[PDB]
Amino acid sequence: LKPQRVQFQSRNFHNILQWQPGRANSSVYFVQYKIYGQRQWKNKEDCWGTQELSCDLTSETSDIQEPYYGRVRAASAGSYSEWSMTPRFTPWWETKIDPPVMNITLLVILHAPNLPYRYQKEKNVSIEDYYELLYRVFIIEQKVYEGAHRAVECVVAEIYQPMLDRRSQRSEE
Amino acid sequence: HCRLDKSNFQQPYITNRTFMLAKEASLADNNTDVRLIGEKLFHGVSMSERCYLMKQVLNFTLEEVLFPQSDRFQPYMQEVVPFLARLSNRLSTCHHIQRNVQKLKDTVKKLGESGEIKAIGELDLLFMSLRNAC
Numbered sequence: 327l328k329p330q331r332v333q334f335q336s337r338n339f340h341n342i343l344q345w346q347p348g349r350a351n352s353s354v355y356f357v358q359y360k361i362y363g364q365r366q367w368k369n370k371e372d373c374w375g376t377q378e379l380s381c382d383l384t385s386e387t388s389d390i391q392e393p394y395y396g397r398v399r400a401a402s403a404g405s406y407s408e409w410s411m412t413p414r415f416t417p418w419w420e421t422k423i424d425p426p427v428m429n430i431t432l433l434v435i436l437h438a439p440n441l442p443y444r445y446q447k448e449k450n451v452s453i454e455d456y457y458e459l460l461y462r463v464f465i466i467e468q469k470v471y472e473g474a475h476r477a478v479e480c481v482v483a484e485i486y487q488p489m490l491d492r493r494s495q496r497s498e499e
Numbered sequence: 500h501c502r503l504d505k506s507n508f509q510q511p512y513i514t515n516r517t518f519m520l521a522k523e524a525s526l527a528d529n530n531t532d533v534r535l536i537g538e539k540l541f542h543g544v545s546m547s548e549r550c551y552l553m554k555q556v557l558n559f560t561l562e563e564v565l566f567p568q569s570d571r572f573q574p575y576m577q578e579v580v581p582f583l584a585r586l587s588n589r590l591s592t593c594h595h596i597q598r599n600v601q602k603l604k605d606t607v608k609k610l611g612e613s614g615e616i617k618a619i620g621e622l623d624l625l626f627m628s629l630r631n632a633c
Binding site for chain 2: 361363365391393411414416488489490491
């Protein structure tokens with residue numbers, strides 16, 4: 327009756343806590359999160375008594391190298407499931423980066439997927455730097471570009487994570 | 500002095516394996532309330548002294564946990580322990596802090612078998628920290 331498959335969907339450092347219902351009376355969910363090592367669990371008030379099977383914990387898990395936990399308990403008709411916890415979640419490690427969106431005019435302008443750090447009021451580093459992302463531009467067959475910027479010269483792009491040797495899937499084109 | 504080359508922490512293979520290894524290990528780690536390499540580890544430690552601290556942790560980790568448990572969490576273990584061993588060397592050197600390192604050490608021991616688990620589940624942290632500290 328515990329929430330099932332409780333995990334973080336992590337794309338572009340948007341960390342959606344998600345889960346399945348599990349054995350049955352309609353259920354609601356209470357999402358809690360914490361940084362590994364915290365004794366207390368933070369209640370996710372936006373997802374607290376939710377009938378939703380996911381919970382955006384992005385703001386809550388925006389120290390990207392931080393080990394995070396999310397857990398969900400279900401409650402139906404007064405009875406509460408046990409807390410279903412996620413594995414330890416480290417956005418930095420776990421998150422998947424979408425392709426950059428690529429505009430050409432060639433003048434290729436790569437837009438990183440929307441990344442929560444786009445929003446950080448004060449930045450000491452670019453988003454690409456922050457997220458240690460690279461843009462890779464290819465011309466269907468060769469890597470014509472790799473950098474954290476946008477490039478002077480069919481063309482496709484991806485984001486590479488030098489640190490994890492992870493390349494996003496391809497941009498369109 | 501006390502530092503490592505950025506390049507040490509920019510080998511994606513081992514970086515990955517460290518996280519994969521820490522991830523495996525942490526799957527087995529239920530003490531979410533207890534984090535070895537956490538803020539309270541550096542509590543009282545100047546950013547300057549952080550690396551010596553991390554040197555310390557890394558060594559304890561290596562000697563007390565990773566070397567002994569090198570037989571487990573394969574393949575990652577046999578890949579990551581060496582890497583971390585190397586860092587141990589590069590870092591042999593220096594410049595109390597033990598009151599914190601010991602807290603970590605004593606924690607790992609109190610946690611016993613899950614302390615080894617946790618210690619391994621935190622190699623990514625030891626890594627990340629080692630990096631930021633050096």
